Amino acid sequence: LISQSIKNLKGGISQQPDILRYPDQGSRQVNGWSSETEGLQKRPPLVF
Amino acid sequence: EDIGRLQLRRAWVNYENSGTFDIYVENQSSNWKYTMAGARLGSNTLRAGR
């Protein structure tokens, strides 16, 4: 029984197929803000 | 590596020629304080005034 942790989430799309791609790379990501210390965040809003 | 539960026990701090820091160990609800003073009994450093 194995396990592993993906430490960061930076980041973004990787349209390369999933047996090739790195960890930290999601398959889609909308309105995300992969910062340095904090990972995924919402992008800050549009004031008017 | 954060996979299994690391049951922690008795961390230790070594120190050069000074002292009297305390130490505050703070769990969720415990709050133990490990106060410390200068030298051990019978040491040549521990004096009745120095």
Swiss-Prot record, chain B:
Interacts with head-to-tail connector protein gp8, the tail component gp11, and the fiber protein gp17. The chain holds residues 696 to 745 of 794 of the full protein. This is Tail tubular protein gp12. It is found in: Virion. Structural component of the short non-contractile tail. The tail complex is involved in viral genome delivery. Forms the end of the tail, including the canonical tube, the nozzle, and the small extensions below the fibers. Once the tail tubular structure is formed, the interface between gp11 and gp12 generates the proper environment to interact with the six gp17 trimers.
